[PDB]
Amino acid sequence: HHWGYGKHNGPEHWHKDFPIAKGERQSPVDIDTHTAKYDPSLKPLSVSYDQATSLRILNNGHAFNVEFDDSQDKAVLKGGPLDGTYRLIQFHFHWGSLDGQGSEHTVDKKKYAAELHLVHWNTKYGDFGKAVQQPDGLAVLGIFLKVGSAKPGLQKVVDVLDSIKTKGKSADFTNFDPRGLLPESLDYWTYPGSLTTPPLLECVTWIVLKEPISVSSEQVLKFRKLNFNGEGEPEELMVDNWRPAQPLKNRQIKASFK
Ligand SMILES: NS(=O)(=O)c1ccc(NC(=O)Nc2ccc(C(F)(F)F)cc2)cc1
Ligand SMILES: [Zn+2]
Structure with a gap:
C-alpha cells in the first residue's frame, strides 16, 4: 500500500508487507554471462506482434504502462522456454536518475540506463489475475536500454509523457506498434523468477534479450520528467524505479546462444 522506491518505503522495506520478497525465486538477478549455460533444449522464440492493439498509457505512480487489448490472441509470445501461448497485456520501463543505472x-554486474518489460500471461489460465497465481503464469520479455542513438519507435511513447505526468493520469494510446522497440537479435537468457514490484509473486518466466536497444539521452531525459506523485501533491521525480539484483539461490540461467 505505501511501497515505493524511496529510503522509507523502498526495496529494503518491501519484505514487511510482502514476505515473499525474501523468497526462493525473486527477480531481478545478475546475469553472470560466464556461468549461464547454452541450452540446446530451447525451442526458437516467436514474437508475434503484427496484430497488437494498444489502447492506453497510464502513470500508475511506479512507472508508466502501455496497455493492450488482450481479449483475443492478437500479440503473443511463444517458443523459447515457454510451453503454450502467452498474450501481451502491457509494457513498461524501469530507469535511473543517471545513465549508469536504471536496469x-x-x-x-553492469547496469543499463533502463529496462523495458513486455508482460505476457499464459492463456491456459484464462485471465491475468489467475495467471499471476501460477508458477508459469507470466512471461516477461526484458530488453536493456543504453544511451546512444535515438530509438525511432520509442518516440511516440516519449511524446505522450507530458500528458501523463502524475500518478493516476492516463491517455489514449492506440495504434502503437511494439515491434519498433525490439533489437535485431532475439538471443536471450532465461530463468524462473518473480514480479519485480509488490506483490513480488513468483509467477514469471523471464526472457532477457542479450542485445540492448539504443535510445537517445533526450528520450531518457523525458522519462525522468515524470512524477511519482499525484497532481496537486509535492513533486517527486519518477527516477530510480528499479529493484536491485536479488539472490539467485537454487537457479540456473540458461542461454539461447553459444
Ligand atoms: N516489473 S515486472 O515486469 O516484474 C511486473 C510487475 C508487476 C506487474 N503487474 C501487472 O501487470 N498487473 C496487472 C496487469 C493487468 C491487470 C488487468 F487489467 F488485467 F486486471 C491487472 C494487474 C507486471 C509486471
Ligand atoms: Zn517491470
Whole structure:
C-alpha cells in the first residue's frame, strides 16, 4: 500500500508487507554471462506482434504502462522456454536518475540506463489475475536500454509523457506498434523468477534479450520528467524505479546462444 522506491518505503522495506520478497525465486538477478549455460533444449522464440492493439498509457505512480487489448490472441509470445501461448497485456520501463543505472537485471554486474518489460500471461489460465497465481503464469520479455542513438519507435511513447505526468493520469494510446522497440537479435537468457514490484509473486518466466536497444539521452531525459506523485501533491521525480539484483539461490540461467 505505501511501497515505493524511496529510503522509507523502498526495496529494503518491501519484505514487511510482502514476505515473499525474501523468497526462493525473486527477480531481478545478475546475469553472470560466464556461468549461464547454452541450452540446446530451447525451442526458437516467436514474437508475434503484427496484430497488437494498444489502447492506453497510464502513470500508475511506479512507472508508466502501455496497455493492450488482450481479449483475443492478437500479440503473443511463444517458443523459447515457454510451453503454450502467452498474450501481451502491457509494457513498461524501469530507469535511473543517471545513465549508469536504471536496469533491474544486470549483466556481469553492469547496469543499463533502463529496462523495458513486455508482460505476457499464459492463456491456459484464462485471465491475468489467475495467471499471476501460477508458477508459469507470466512471461516477461526484458530488453536493456543504453544511451546512444535515438530509438525511432520509442518516440511516440516519449511524446505522450507530458500528458501523463502524475500518478493516476492516463491517455489514449492506440495504434502503437511494439515491434519498433525490439533489437535485431532475439538471443536471450532465461530463468524462473518473480514480479519485480509488490506483490513480488513468483509467477514469471523471464526472457532477457542479450542485445540492448539504443535510445537517445533526450528520450531518457523525458522519462525522468515524470512524477511519482499525484497532481496537486509535492513533486517527486519518477527516477530510480528499479529493484536491485536479488539472490539467485537454487537457479540456473540458461542461454539461447553459444
Ligand atoms: N516489473 S515486472 O515486469 O516484474 C511486473 C510487475 C508487476 C506487474 N503487474 C501487472 O501487470 N498487473 C496487472 C496487469 C493487468 C491487470 C488487468 F487489467 F488485467 F486486471 C491487472 C494487474 C507486471 C509486471
Ligand atoms: Zn517491470
